[PDB]
Amino acid sequence: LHKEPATLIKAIDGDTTKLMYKGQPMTFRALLVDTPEFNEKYGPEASAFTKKMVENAKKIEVEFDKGQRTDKYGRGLAYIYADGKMTNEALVRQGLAKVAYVYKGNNTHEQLLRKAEAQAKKEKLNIWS
Template sequence: MEEEPKDQRLEQDAYGNEEISDRLEVTVAEFIDGDTTRFNYNGSNESFRYLMIDTPETKHSRHGEEPYGHEASERTEELLSNAEKIEIEFDVGPKQDDYDRYLVYVYADGEMVNEILVREGLAEVKYVNPPNDTYVDILKNAQQEAQAANLGIWSEDD
């Protein structure tokens, strides 16, 4: 059986080093919340959870809407709606979680949405499960910047 061709190309990582990218282009099927989106993938509508981040809840059965949950959801929708190209990238570990959601890094026009949400104080680094932790240092640095600037969930007035 032949393996499907991958969308491989040379990219630059955050440090300017060239690397091969295995990103796959997708389209949005439905916005769920800040860290979960349904994408059209392999011919069907599938749920995707953004790796290593957690945004405040908007529709939680017990907690209801948490502070900054609405802002995180709106920001994710804005980034993806305005993107000409949306891509996903799997890490080297399990591709799905216990809820059958695909685990990915999401890119809007080449910029990692996971990192943008953390850097803007709309998500925290959470659920770091090796080996799905390739970009943990990038995300932790973004979180330190958001905390130092008291942005969003890290603001002092909450």
């Protein structure tokens, strides 16, 4: 897989962010994870966490997987990096997202993310508390 440039337009919530990608505004949904909605327990924390990552980053990148690049809502489906740190994995490692929505063909980083979720669960972090 390959990282490609994007710039932040605005934080939305834990697993969605508005980015400019090839010069066009797009909402990106993070592959392989599910954060709680803002109105559920840990939703505000998950939103805050991703917001801090993307707003503080000097360089945001998006990495598509081998399968679908947009979902049925027109959202880009990617792994989203902030200064080289993947937000998808960082949310799971902190117990602020669950590995979820693992569809055959867009699942390159599944095992990396499961390893993180195991560690967050062992630490009883947040969602796992």
